[PDB]
Ligand binder design. Structure first.
Ligand SMILES: Nc1nc2c(ncn2[C@@H]2O[C@H](COP(=O)(O)OP(=O)(O)NP(=O)(O)O)[C@@H](O)[C@H]2O)c(=O)[nH]1
Ligand SMILES: [Mg+2]
Ligand SMILES: [Zn+2]
Lengths: 113, 50, 311
RNA sequence: AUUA
């Protein structure tokens, strides 16, 4: 038994763009984690189709980082809504264990296709 | 200064390891032999290869 | 009546199946082995006690026992379907042991079994634990492993101070006979990681799910994702296996012409001193899925921790 | 692994 993060995590909210300051209001289901030292997001989901940038606000507000994203992946979801498509992203430099954590939680707690 | 120059110019930028300068440019060789069994396997005869 | 002699020929597959029970009937077998556990209430790398397994050793032409076992286990019905699905997705890899799913009745009810074919007696975790927790008072596992793979003979241990490093420096030559097995295990691990990435499966790799031939099994803690987006976690595996890579000198075959232990050595020119590309090729060949930037020259490191990591 |  070597499980991949039994106790899960909580939350997904805020914004995104494609060229630095292109993040206007909210274009991301920026997913998970409020660590013990502070809010540190892990996963990003996008009902849109192409984004390279985002801006998550936290604590001071003045400190809100223009995150560099990575080339996306695509999948369809088994929501009660029906046909729903996003394009998956992770914050760049995210190590393998964190991606495994968020993928396992997303797949095992909520239904996808 | 002729063998040293000959092996320096073959280097792609002028740098060579220090451990191969006596190995390829020295004129004299010294061998220390513990016993006869080692002697007959290293420098037997009048000319040997190393 | 029946049962034992019918379970025997049901576990017996379709290839040759010359089997003999390991002192059991239809019941399980109990052993003392090493595991790597993390299940939210327990953690560590210790020797627990296995409980649910029936083992059948395999014979050959001259009716003498061989190093091949058929391990069949029983469990619930949901794990049956989950493991069957994952194996069906992963069955074409040449680094995955051959599974066999069947159903057999022990009583009025029918219970499911999963049978794995042609495993060895010990896993890689057993070897790592034996070498990392040495005790000359009781080292039966290490001696058995050494004698079953033609590293030495049973009378080598009649010597005293056979294990010492200062006295008897021949134990280094004795240990250096497992390097090829370790290297083949590393290559099969890389193959398994590639297959998992291509199939879209997420899981964490441990040392006790791989035997001493390199084959993999036990897909009970894996999940499923979209194809092409799989991710294996290989931190504990490589981190725990690292100290054994230099004791056994596993990378000796890399100094020969075609990475073959029967050909002469490579003849580098005496004027070459960079070797910056060979290091990258070796890292990409043996440590492909280790996800942390590697600097061949430690002048480009970011701090002392990175210097330690790359050195 | 002692969750089978
Ligand atoms: N290679 C090998 N391992 C054995 C044998 N008998 C018992 N074992 C031990 O028992 C385990 C049997 O495999 P399995 O239970 O599928 O692996 P696991 O790591 O315990 N996971 P799980 O309990 O989720 O099935 C191995 O991990 C190993 O440590 C044997 O004959 N060969
Ligand atoms: Mg087990
Ligand atoms: Zn570094």
């Amino acid at each position: 038994n070597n499980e991949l993060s039994p106790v899960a995590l909580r939350q997904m909210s805020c914004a995104a763009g494609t060229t630095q300051t292109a993040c206007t209001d909210d274009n991301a289901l920026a997913y998970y984690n409020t660590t013990k030292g502070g809010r540190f997001v892990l996963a990003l989901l996008s009902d849109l189709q192409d984004l390279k940038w985002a801006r998550f606000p936290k604590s001071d507000g003045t400190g809100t980082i223009y995150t560099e994203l990575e080339p996306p992946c695509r999948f369809v979801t088994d929501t009660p809504k029906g046909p729903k498509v996003k394009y998956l992203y992770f914050i760049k430099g995210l190590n393998n264990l964190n991606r495994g954590m968020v993928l396992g939680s997303l797949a095992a707690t909520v239904r996808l296709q | 200064n002729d063998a040293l120059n000959n092996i320096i110019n073959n280097a792609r930028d002028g740098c060579v390891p220090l451990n191969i300068i006596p190995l390829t440019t020295a004129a004299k060789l010294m061998v220390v032999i513990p016993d006869y069994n080692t002697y007959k396997n290293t420098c037997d005869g009048t000319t040997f290869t190393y | 009546s029946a049962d034992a002699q019918s379970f025997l020929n049901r576990v017996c597959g379709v290839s040759a199946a010359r089997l003999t029970p390991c002192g059991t009937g239809t019941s399980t077998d109990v052993v003392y082995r090493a595991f790597d556990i993390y299940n939210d209430k327990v953690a560590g790398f210790a020797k627990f006690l296995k409980t649910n397994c029936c083992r059948f050793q395999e014979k050959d032409e001259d009716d003498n026992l061989i190093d091949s076992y058929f391990v069949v286990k029983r469990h619930t019905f949901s794990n049956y379907q989950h493991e069957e699905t994952i194996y069906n997705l992963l069955k074409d890899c040449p680094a995955v042991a051959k599974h066999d799913f069947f159903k057999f009745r022990i009583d009025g009810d029918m219970v499911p079994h999963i049978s794995r074919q042609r495993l060895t007696k010990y896993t890689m975790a057993d070897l790592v634990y034996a070498l990392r927790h040495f005790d000359e008072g009781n080292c039966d596992t290490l001696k058995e492993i050494l004698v079953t793979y033609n590293c030495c003979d049973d009378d080598y241990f009649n010597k005293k101070d056979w294990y010492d490093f200062v006295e008897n420096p021949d134990i280094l030559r004795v240990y250096a006979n497992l390097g090829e097995r370790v290297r083949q295990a590393l290559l099969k691990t890389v193959q398994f990681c590639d297959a998992m990435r291509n199939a879209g499966i997420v899981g964490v790799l441990t040392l006790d799910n791989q035997d001493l031939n390199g084959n993999w099994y036990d897909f009970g803690d894996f999940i499923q994702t979209t194809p092409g987006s799989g991710v294996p976690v290989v931190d504990s595996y490589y981190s725990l296996l690292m100290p054994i890579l230099t004791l056994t000198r596993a990378l000796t075959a890399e100094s020969h012409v075609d990475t073959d232990l029967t050909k002469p050595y490579i003849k580098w020119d005496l004027l070459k001193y960079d070797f910056t590309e060979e290091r990258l090729k070796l890292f990409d060949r043996y440590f492909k899925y280790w996800d942390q930037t590697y600097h061949p020259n430690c002048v480009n490191c970011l701090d002392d921790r990175c210097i330690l990591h790359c050195a």
